[PDB]
Amino acid sequence: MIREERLLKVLRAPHVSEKASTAMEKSNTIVLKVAKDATKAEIKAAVQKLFEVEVEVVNTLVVKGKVKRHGQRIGRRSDWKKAYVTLKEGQNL
Amino acid sequence: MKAKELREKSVEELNTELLNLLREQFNLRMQAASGQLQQSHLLKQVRRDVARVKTLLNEKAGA
Amino acid sequence: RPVYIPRPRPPHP
Amino acid sequence: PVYIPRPRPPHPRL
Amino acid sequence: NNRPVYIPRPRPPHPRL
Amino acid sequence: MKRTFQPSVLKRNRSHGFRARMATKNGRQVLARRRAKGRARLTVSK
RNA sequence: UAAGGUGAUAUGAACCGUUAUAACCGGCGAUUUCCGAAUGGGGAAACCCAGUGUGUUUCGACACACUAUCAUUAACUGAAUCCAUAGGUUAAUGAGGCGAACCGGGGGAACUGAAACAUCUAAGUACCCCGAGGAAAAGAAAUCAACCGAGAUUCCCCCAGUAGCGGCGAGCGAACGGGGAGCAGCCCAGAGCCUGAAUCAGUGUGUGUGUUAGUGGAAGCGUCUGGAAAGGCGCGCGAUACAGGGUGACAGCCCCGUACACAAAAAUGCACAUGCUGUGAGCUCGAUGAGUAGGGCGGGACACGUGGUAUCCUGUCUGAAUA
RNA sequence: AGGACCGAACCGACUAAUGUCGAAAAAUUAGCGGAUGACUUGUGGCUGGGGGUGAAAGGCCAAUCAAACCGGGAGAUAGCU
RNA sequence: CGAAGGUGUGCUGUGAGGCAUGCUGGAGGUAUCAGAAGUGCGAAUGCUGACAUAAGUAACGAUAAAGCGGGUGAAAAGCCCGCUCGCCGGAAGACCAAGGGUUCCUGUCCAACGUUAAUCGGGGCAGGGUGAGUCGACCCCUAAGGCGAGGCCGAAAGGCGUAGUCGAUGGGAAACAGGUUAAUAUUCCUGUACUUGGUGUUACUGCGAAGGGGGGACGGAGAAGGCUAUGUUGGCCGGGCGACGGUUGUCCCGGUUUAAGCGUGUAGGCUGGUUUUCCAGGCAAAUCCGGAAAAUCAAGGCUGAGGCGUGAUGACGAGGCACUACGGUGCUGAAGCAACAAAUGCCCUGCUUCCAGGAAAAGCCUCUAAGCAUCAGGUAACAUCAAAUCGUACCCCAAACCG
């Protein structure tokens, strides 16, 4: 059983932006970064345990890294997955 | 911080790994992302500590 | 660099 | 904080 | 500097026979 | 004026893809030659 | 080994260490995602979808392991018919793929040359395919020689552009013999007496040597020019070390090195001695390889193109003697 | 009913002019033929070089075809410049 | 207190050359005598780089077209705003698939790129943006075709092919309306729905296949009927009565919209139902299909657009009012009907005709063999749970795809 440690690694970081702020104040939902796989069930369990909050539903999407032109060279950013988590009437963070 | 935990039983080794993963690994990561972490050297130090514990578990369990 | 996911996204006509 | 290398003499006006 | 990858194909306007 | 190249990902992969080369020994030699030359792209990868 | 470090572009931020677990180097271990022989099935490579068996927070759902094909072996099952066989399932062992050349084998050009061109040449070359090794192949005379003699194979220099072959054209081109490198001989087709009896292969121990980190390593100063001297001038010292590299211009004596003398907890190749395992010494008698040798027909290889053409190999049809 | 008629989309290219270092390595403008069929078109397959395919021109087979392209034999050969 | 190289000058030898030196240069060069050559270039329509010429010449890519005021700015014919003018309108509009791969939105900059300028941009830099049980992929099934355990064949490589397994361009369960972002929505929010599975409870019950049957399941053309999308007019509601004559009137302007689902069952289309008995047929069996007999009624059953109710005393709604970082935000909100016309769309994979005679398999329904029938399983109702993963930006007759 590695479910506990798995839940401690799916979550990577919160997402800060205008869309994130308006979603939180209006829809009571938090947007955060997750691992590349990060199935919806794992994200739901991780938020319930680590943040000790009740959740309703999770929506995930994959963001493709942009292609950047650094110096004389061309590079690409890494793809990452962000999840929208909808909390219930009781919210903490 | 290598031979201090060599003689502990497997039960404590799993316990210390869980709190290493739980605290100072997840919490530090959230702090760094939010910009509230100023001592970024803890992140690497904690990661190496987790590796050390896992190395002991393998040479303890089974083989 | 290489993208490998040309999945189909057909919006209902 | 990203280091900027020296560009070509017809570089952008940065 | 660079060899033209395409060479146009001409025609014989004047048979000159 | 319709041109010779009409792109199609499915046709490109099924014709010159990695698995197409490995099916026959001639394709395997094509991969072997390009590994020796050190080419970054072994085949047309989606 | 260590007073420095956290690889580079590439600075910074935050830190570790300074007498020893900072960092770095070497041996032995651990982790080792996905694709790829890819091997659970599939597939547009890095993706999708499973079955069975082991253990667990809300049934929820999780973690690990196994599950390809082929060949051999063993077990259990098992038809058309009694037996049987084919077939099926299970377990173990081995293989699969990749890699520059060299080696052996199976196929095999044309351009070109001949001042054309068909025999011939190019050439058994290029190329394709198969198999193995660190080398491979070949190898202990049904061989040469000349009636004097040498005694496995392989490689180099002669013999020698010689004898021969050849639309006797273009071209191809030996052998005998001699000088060298290196040398090693055996076993089965079978019984008896004597039975570890030498030599070998695999696993332990011990010595020596080498590889994988390293340590010490001699001896120069003053003036002149100059941005700066290692240069000029003057006087010294080291050398089993003036091989090299660096240092603000050209350094034996500033630094790293160099000759030289040492170094190994652990893993390793090589040459020996000592144990175990397995086949196996020595003597007498006998035996001593048959669809084979040879032959007819058609081809190929031997320098030798069917010519007066020996010898070898083979597709086809025949076919002995056996000391 | 019709390989029927007129005529758009669609398919094709009979005439003229323009354009020939063009907007374009065959197009534009004005006319023109077929337009329920031997029609046209999307997607995916199959046929490979002395071979394919061809209502047959030596046509087409990636802007290249009386023998495609790439690498090799190969520095082929050249009594010629 | 100045090597090679570079650049001038002066001497010198019959020549290729040599010598001395001024300035730049900045650290290498090499006598004499011998030795070895990648040893000497003006040509090869030689090769590579650089730079001329034509020449400040042709051209600046559809003859759909621009004008003015204000703003920003160092600078405005090209950018922003405003008022006119012109062009497309079966497109030069709005959507996709394929193909591109961040071109999308905001801030900032004008070197290069844009056939000119540029404050502008599909340009540079930074940040932001793609939300699904119902869409699609994935997944179940299969066509052409591919691969192919054994197998057959072939010097080797390999060819063909059975069982199988892949292969959408096809078949298979399910969501609509409104609102919202600078950029996503049938994915987010509000409202109202629907589909397929697991588990649990209750009441009944025979369940059970790669096997059987049904269904899925299909051509061309033609015609009529019923409809709807949509349009026009009248009525209704709100506003207007008007800078050049007239216009309270049969006058002018704007609006008059509302889905999926659920219930009803119509126009139309198809077929005769029900009960009993029997049968070597459906590679075994069968209550299923097929076939043969009788009795009975004359109806039943299947399919089916639209309409009508509910969905919805909800949403939307012209306009009005209050503030504008003066882009826009908030609040409020009347009427919301009828008639006529009408499709290439639906009823219709229908019907009527014609010869060229017009896929497959699964999902689904149904019947049984082996096996178990105190079980298991199935049916009906309720509760709960689950529906993962991947695509979702933007262009898409084009400045973003192939040229």
Sign (positive/negative) of CA torsion E3, E7, E12, E17? positive
Contact predicate A83/A34, CB 8 Å: yes
- Does B18 contact A11 at a Cβ distance shorter than 8 Å? no
Instruction: State which CATH number among 1.10.940.10, 1.10.287.3980, 1.10.569.10, 1.20.1250.20 fits the domain covering F1-46.
Output: 1.10.287.3980
DSSP state of F24: S
Instruction: State which CATH number among 3.40.50.360, 1.10.357.10, 3.40.50.1820, 3.30.70.330 fits the domain covering A1-93.
Output: 3.30.70.330
Closest among A19, A32, A10 to A85, alpha carbons compared: A32
Read off the tokens for A88: 């219930």
Q: What is the 3-state secondary structure (H, E, C) of chain A?
A: CCHHHHHHHHEEEECCCHHHHHHHHHHCEEEEEECCCCCHHHHHHHHHHHCCCCEEEEEEEEECCCEEEECCEEEECCCEEEEEEEECCCCCC
DSSP state letters, chain B: --SSSSSS-HHHHHHHHHHHHIIIIIHHHHHHHHT----THHHHHHHHHHHHHHHHHHHHS--
Angle at F33 between CA F30 and CA F38, to 5 degrees: 125
Using CB atoms, which chains have 3+ pairs under 8 A with E? none
Q: CA-to-C1' distance for A62 and I95, Å?
A: 26
Given phi > 0 = left and psi -120 to 50 = alpha, else beta, which region is A18? alpha
Tallying the residues shown for chain D, one arrives at 14
CA A47 to chain centre: 10
Of all residues in chain B, the one with the smallest CA distance to A1 is: B14
How were these coordinates obtained?
cryo-EM
* CA C3 vs CA A68, A90, F34: distances in Å: 15, 41, 22
All residues of chain C having their beta carbon less than 8 Å from the beta carbon of residue F44 are none
Sign (positive/negative) of CA torsion A50, A56, A62, A65? negative
Q: Where are the domains of chain A?
A: 1-93
Candidates A5, A13, A33; nearest CB to B21:
A5
Of all residues in chain C, the one with the smallest CA distance to F46 is: C4
In degrees rounded to 5, what are phi and psi of residue E6? Answer: -100, 135
Contact predicate B32/B43, CB 8 Å: yes
Q: Where are the domains of chain F?
A: 1-46
CB atoms within 10 A of CB A82: 19
Read off the tokens for B42: 């803890």
